Amino acid sequence: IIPVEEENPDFWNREAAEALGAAKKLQPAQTAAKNLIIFLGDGMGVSTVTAARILKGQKKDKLGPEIPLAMDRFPYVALSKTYNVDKHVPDSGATATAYLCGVKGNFQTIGLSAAARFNQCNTTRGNEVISVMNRAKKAGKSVGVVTTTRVQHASPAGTYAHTVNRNWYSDADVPASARQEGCQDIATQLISNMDIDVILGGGRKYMFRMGTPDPEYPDDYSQGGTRLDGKNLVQEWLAKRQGARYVWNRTELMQASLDPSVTHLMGLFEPGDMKYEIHRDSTLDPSLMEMTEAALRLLSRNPRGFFLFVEGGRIDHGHHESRAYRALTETIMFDDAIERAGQLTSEEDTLSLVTADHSHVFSFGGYPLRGSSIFGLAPGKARDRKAYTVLLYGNGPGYVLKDGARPDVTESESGSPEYRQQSAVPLDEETHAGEDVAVFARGPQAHLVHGVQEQTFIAHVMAFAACLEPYTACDLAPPAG
Amino acid sequence: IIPVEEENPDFWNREAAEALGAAKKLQPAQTAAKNLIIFLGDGMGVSTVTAARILKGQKKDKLGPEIPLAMDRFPYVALSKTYNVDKHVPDSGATATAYLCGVKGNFQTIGLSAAARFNQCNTTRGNEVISVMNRAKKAGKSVGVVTTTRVQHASPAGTYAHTVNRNWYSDADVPASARQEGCQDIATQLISNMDIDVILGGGRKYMFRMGTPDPEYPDDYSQGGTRLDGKNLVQEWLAKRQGARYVWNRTELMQASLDPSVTHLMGLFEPGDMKYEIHRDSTLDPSLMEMTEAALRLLSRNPRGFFLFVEGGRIDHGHHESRAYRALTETIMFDDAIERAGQLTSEEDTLSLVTADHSHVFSFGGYPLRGSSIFGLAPGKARDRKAYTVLLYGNGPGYVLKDGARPDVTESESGSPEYRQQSAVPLDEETHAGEDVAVFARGPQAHLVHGVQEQTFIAHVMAFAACLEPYTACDLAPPAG
Numbered sequence: 001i002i003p004v005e006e007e008n009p010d011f012w013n014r015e016a017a018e019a020l021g022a023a024k025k026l027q028p029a030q031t032a033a034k035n036l037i038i039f040l041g042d043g044m045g046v047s048t049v050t051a052a053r054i055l056k057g058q059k060k061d062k063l064g065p066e067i068p069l070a071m072d073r074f075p076y077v078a079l080s081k082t083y084n085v086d087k088h089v090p091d092s093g094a095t096a097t098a099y100l101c102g103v104k105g106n107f108q109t110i111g112l113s114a115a116a117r118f119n120q121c122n123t124t125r126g127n128e129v130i131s132v133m134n135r136a137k138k139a140g141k142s143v144g145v146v147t148t149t150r151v152q153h154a155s156p157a158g159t160y161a162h163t164v165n166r167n168w169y170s171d172a173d174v175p176a177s178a179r180q181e182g183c184q185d186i187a188t189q190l191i192s193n194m195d196i197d198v199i200l201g202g203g204r205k206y207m208f209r210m211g212t213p214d215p216e217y218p219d220d221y222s223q224g225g226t227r228l229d230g231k232n233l234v235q236e237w238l239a240k241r242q243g244a245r246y247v248w249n250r251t252e253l254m255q256a257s258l259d260p261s262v263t264h265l266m267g268l269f270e271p272g273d274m275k276y277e278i279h280r281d282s283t284l285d286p287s288l289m290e291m292t293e294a295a296l297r298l299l300s301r302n303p304r305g306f307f308l309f310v311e312g313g314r315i316d317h318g319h320h321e322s323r324a325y326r327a328l329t330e331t332i333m334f335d336d337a338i339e340r341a342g343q344l345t346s347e348e349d350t351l352s353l354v355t356a357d358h359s360h361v362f363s364f365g366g367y368p369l370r371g372s373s374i375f376g377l378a379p380g381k382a383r384d385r386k387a388y389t390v391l392l393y394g395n396g397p398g399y400v401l402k403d404g405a406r407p408d409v410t411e412s413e414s415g416s417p418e419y420r421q422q423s424a425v426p427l428d429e430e431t432h433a434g435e436d437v438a439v440f441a442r443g444p445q446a447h448l449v450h451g452v453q454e455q456t457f458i459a460h461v462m463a464f465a466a467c468l469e470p471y472t473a474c475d476l477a478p479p480a481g
Numbered sequence: 482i483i484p485v486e487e488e489n490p491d492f493w494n495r496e497a498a499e500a501l502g503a504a505k506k507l508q509p510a511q512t513a514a515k516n517l518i519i520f521l522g523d524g525m526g527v528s529t530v531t532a533a534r535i536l537k538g539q540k541k542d543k544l545g546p547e548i549p550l551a552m553d554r555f556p557y558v559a560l561s562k563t564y565n566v567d568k569h570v571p572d573s574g575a576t577a578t579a580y581l582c583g584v585k586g587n588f589q590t591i592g593l594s595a596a597a598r599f600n601q602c603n604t605t606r607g608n609e610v611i612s613v614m615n616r617a618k619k620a621g622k623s624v625g626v627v628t629t630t631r632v633q634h635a636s637p638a639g640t641y642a643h644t645v646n647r648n649w650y651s652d653a654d655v656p657a658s659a660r661q662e663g664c665q666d667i668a669t670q671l672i673s674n675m676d677i678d679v680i681l682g683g684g685r686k687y688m689f690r691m692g693t694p695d696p697e698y699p700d701d702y703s704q705g706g707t708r709l710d711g712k713n714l715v716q717e718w719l720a721k722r723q724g725a726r727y728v729w730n731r732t733e734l735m736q737a738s739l740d741p742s743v744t745h746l747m748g749l750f751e752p753g754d755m756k757y758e759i760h761r762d763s764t765l766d767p768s769l770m771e772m773t774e775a776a777l778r779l780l781s782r783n784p785r786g787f788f789l790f791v792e793g794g795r796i797d798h799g800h801h802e803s804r805a806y807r808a809l810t811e812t813i814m815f816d817d818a819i820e821r822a823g824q825l826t827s828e829e830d831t832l833s834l835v836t837a838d839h840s841h842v843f844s845f846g847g848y849p850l851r852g853s854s855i856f857g858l859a860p861g862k863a864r865d866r867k868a869y870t871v872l873l874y875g876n877g878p879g880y881v882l883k884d885g886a887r888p889d890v891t892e893s894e895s896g897s898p899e900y901r902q903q904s905a906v907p908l909d910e911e912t913h914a915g916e917d918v919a920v921f922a923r924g925p926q927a928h929l930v931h932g933v934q935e936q937t938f939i940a941h942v943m944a945f946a947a948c949l950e951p952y953t954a955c956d957l958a959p960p961a962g
């Protein structure tokens with residue numbers, strides 16, 4: 001569909017003149033950031049952003065690509081180079097080290113320099129690199145970790161953990177040799193490494209001993225406690241902190257977030273990862289947006305400011321399944337959380353960065369008409385005279401041969417939330433991709449986010465802006481009101 | 482391979498501190514641009530840039546992803562939204578209208594607002610939108626169009642032409658009805674619409690009458706003149722201009738570029754598109770880099786400045802063939818031309834933008850090791866126990882079934898310049914992709930290139946910077962020395 005207003009060159013000339021005017025009004029702050037927020041869209045590469053934009057645009061009453069995402073409104077954009085030291089196409093652990101600790105690492109480690117080696121506990125010590133969240137806490141700020149994955153998953157773990165193996169969620173996962181050598185599971189590190197004021201996401205099961213019924217799924221043993229060391233890490237965490245509260249459902253989260261006596265909040269809402277937003281039980285579980293508001297309610301109380309990590313963690317998971325519907329709906333909720341945080345904080349004193357840890361082999365092609373569904377079929381048949389979708393993957397579990405040939409696809413099929421887009425190469429899981437991802441920035445010192453940068457720049461600019469870390473002797477004035 | 486220097490966090494901390502220092506030194510110009518250059522990598526989306534970076538890095542003596550491209554050095558980056566008014570995944574014609582004329586258009590038209598309709602000559606008039614190159618000429622600047630495609634191809638044609646059908650290269654292509662209605666073929670528009678000081682690229686055949694032997698391929702009739710109207714457009718062009726010269730090979734180009742008497746230069750180096758750089762005869766044909774230097778030699782003579790369009794036009798073609806080797810080697814030469822232009826001009830008075838018209842369904846995945854060839858195999862077998870490549874396409878002519886199954890692939894195979902990477906969906910040509918592309922900018926007013934912008938912003942910022950177009954009453958001081 002051709003929107004009639006766009007047929008007039010005046011439309012485009014007016015928009016561009018407005019854009020130039022806005023561009024000219026941008027000015028760098030001379031003041032520090034009081035608060036720091038990093039919004040991390042796990043797997044949310046450039047093709048994901050554009051596809052999500054079109055979907056969100058249409059979710060409103062619009063054609064799609066012309067409607068800005070909340071992240072699109074951020075004034076400063078850079079490209080981020082995501083390679084890990086040892087692999088061109090990275091994982092979430094070692095990218096987390098980059099954008100949260102300011103140092104690149106090796107694939108599948110977390111919070112360690114690249115002198116460490118994956119799954120070799122005895123290469124850990126001396127290679128720990130401290131996150132800017134840790135440094136923010138050291139400087140008296142409150143700190144929060146919010147995600148739709150397990151809070152022990154690779155991305156959030158980058159804010160607090162140091163491990164040669166991202167798979168070490170609980171003691172049950174850690175080999176005897178590594179346990180003897182003192183490599184602590186990530187769940188233990190979560191409560192032990194540093195004080196964290198707000199922890200919200202999944203990962204209940206790793207906190208409790210084997211035999212402990214999950215409170216939400218008391219009749220499903222696979223959802224129960226995993227620990228072999230008899231520890232209740234939740235009780236241990238509560239015991240270290242006056243004003244600490246543990247919650248496992250949305251109603252208790254709400255109560256806690258408005259309770260002036262709380263000060264420390266741990267909310268673990270599923271045994272493992274949280275459900276996809278399209279499957280979320282809105283009585284029992286908070287959305288990503290709701291969890292970020294809850295975090296902001298508590299974190300904002302500290303007059304020294306806060307550091308907040310917010311992850312759209314299952315964008316990645318959708319793409320791994322080659323179910324773009326799941327990837328893109330997770331991305332929209334992520335963008336909704338960004339928008340919400342923007343309403344609850346000031347860009348006068350809050351530096352917000354939105355970025356991705358890496359991308360996926362997700363593409364948006366064919367020659368679809370303006371206004372057509374992102375989950376639809378490309379116009380015109382493929383060379384094999386069967387239909388194909390505008391969304392495709394390079395590799396992954398959507399590769400199919402039915403009776404020795406690529407299957408035809410219908411619109412009803414392609415639009416289903418369970419539909420897996422086709423790929424070139426069958427894999428149980430679609431693969432991350434190695435191309436640069438965007439960094440979007442707003443707030444004090446956001447203008448420093450520019451050009452093409454190593455992914456480590458994200459951590460460094462955040463530390464600099466708040467005069468943390470290796471950067472007091474930041475030559476900045478106190479945060480603006 | 483893990484580079485040992487990168488195992489030390491100091492390495493990353495030093496790099497980031499240097500990056501922050503550089504970021505802080507950036508300051509906006511208060512002065513106008515004397516000169517304008519747009520470097521257009523046709524099809525050069527974010528995945529192309531990163532893959533090309535790795536390849537170029539290795540072409541040097543390096544591991545790949547850590548070595549900046551020339552374009553990576555540009556201080557200002559934005560994301561560009563490429564949708565055409567009528568299609569989410571655009572073509573080169575209507576994107577050209579956006580980034581060269583500042584107005585979005587309909588798929589496969591050039592230099593027309595979206596009130597026009599593809600292949601409907603009688604919707605042309607009133608819908609012409611004037612390029613910033615045209616406006617630069619009007620303001621007394623010299624202007625040049627340089628590309629590896631036919632100079633009548635969609636991208637260069639955006640600088641000078643207005644047509645409802647990008648396929649109308651010569652009169653032979655234009656239907657009788659459209660000819661009667663006065664829709665001129667693009668070759669005619671090239672010599673007739675505006676004065677162009679330098680025209681370099683392919684497209685000889687459209688300038689000469691049927692029967693005219695090509696000077697370079699006088700024994701291949703398919704390469705000869707195409708025109709049915711008896712016109713010699715080269716002789717016509719020469720006849721309008723004292724100091725005009727026509728060349729068709731590299732040696733004559735060189736001679737012309739150093740000849741003070743020349744002033745107007747048309748160099749048409751192949752009948753159609755120029756050969757891929759890997760197939761270029763370096764005695765007979767100039768590289769893109771050589772053509773941009775030749776253009777700069779002449780254009781720089783004008784004290785009022787110049788506008789220059791430089792296109793890496795066959796990046797796109799490589800991807801369409803699903804031959805990433807061709808796409809990425811074209812991208813490197815494009816980056817080499819950018820680098821060269823940077824050596825021959827000053828960022829004190831020259832605004833240079835590098836961008837792409839749109840992307841491709843090209844992905845870079847698997848989990849390859851640091852330092853491995855971009856054309857290599859992903860580590861580990863696919864689910865069908867056969868190998869697969871790190872580079873893949875969503876769709877295109879690399880889809881194969883040999884004996885009813887996806888074929889295995891070897892490193893020798895995958896590294897060949899003729900190898901077509903596999904896709905999910907067989908098409909004669911791989912498809913463009915609709916995700917945002919980068920804009921890189923340096924020079925006066927380059928700081929205005931920021932955030933996420935409509936593709937039209939590229940034209941507008943260029944006009945603004947040089948105080949052209951709807952922008953005198955730019956509030957800018959004269960160009961710096």
Ligand SMILES: *[C@@H]1O[C@H](CO)[C@@H](O)[C@H](O)[C@H]1NC(C)=O
Binds near residue numbers: 120122123
């Ligand atoms: C780590 O332990 C393994 C297994 O005993 C041994 O081969 C290796 O030398 C150790 N590395 C270090 C750094 O001690």
Ligand SMILES: *[C@@H]1O[C@H](CO)[C@@H](O)[C@H](O)[C@H]1NC(C)=O
Binds near residue numbers: 247248249251283
């Ligand atoms: C939420 O958790 C509390 C225990 O902290 C429990 O009393 C309440 O029943 C829970 N809500 C639901 C719906 O299970």
Ligand SMILES: *[C@@H]1O[C@H](CO)[C@@H](O)[C@H](O)[C@H]1NC(C)=O
Binds near residue numbers: 601604
């Ligand atoms: C263009 O010509 C076609 C064919 O005669 C006709 O159907 C159409 O109405 C014309 N459109 C305009 C704008 O005159």
Ligand SMILES: *[C@@H]1O[C@H](CO)[C@@H](O)[C@H](O)[C@H]1NC(C)=O
Binds near residue numbers: 729732
């Ligand atoms: C280049 O073109 C000129 C004619 O302008 C011709 O004299 C010369 O032979 C050409 N060079 C080659 C190698 O064909």
Ligand SMILES: CP(=O)(O)Oc1ccc([N+](=O)[O-])cc1
Binds near residue numbers: 090432848
């Ligand atoms: C499929 P396989 O188990 O072999 O390998 C991988 C394990 C983890 C990973 N990551 O993104 O952390 C990528 C590949």
Ligand SMILES: CP(=O)(O)Oc1ccc([N+](=O)[O-])cc1
Binds near residue numbers: 254255257290291294
């Ligand atoms: C989605 P909506 O913002 O409307 O509602 C909620 C917001 C915050 C919250 N909390 O526990 O902080 C719970 C629900």
Ligand SMILES: CP(=O)(O)Oc1ccc([N+](=O)[O-])cc1
Binds near residue numbers: 367380589
């Ligand atoms: C394959 P078919 O000829 O049908 O269509 C197309 C023609 C041109 C084009 N373009 O990128 O300008 C895209 C598709």
Ligand SMILES: CP(=O)(O)Oc1ccc([N+](=O)[O-])cc1
Binds near residue numbers: 731774
């Ligand atoms: C590739 P290299 O730059 O070395 O050589 C040339 C540079 C310019 C030129 N000209 O005709 O303007 C011809 C060749």
Ligand SMILES: O=[P-]([O-])[O-]
Binds near residue numbers: 091
């Ligand atoms: O490796 P990551 O996407 O959890």
Ligand SMILES: O=[P-]([O-])[O-]
Binds near residue numbers: 523572573574635797
């Ligand atoms: O449509 P274009 O890539 O020539």
Ligand SMILES: [Ca+2]
Binds near residue numbers: 216269284285
């Ligand atoms: Ca729950």
Ligand SMILES: [Ca+2]
Binds near residue numbers: 697729750751765766
């Ligand atoms: Ca030639």
Ligand SMILES: [Mg+2]
Binds near residue numbers: 042153156
């Ligand atoms: Mg994650």
Ligand SMILES: [Mg+2]
Binds near residue numbers: 523635
């Ligand atoms: Mg082109």
Ligand SMILES: [Zn+2]
Binds near residue numbers: 091316357358
């Ligand atoms: Zn990830």
Ligand SMILES: [Zn+2]
Binds near residue numbers: 092
């Ligand atoms: Zn992943």
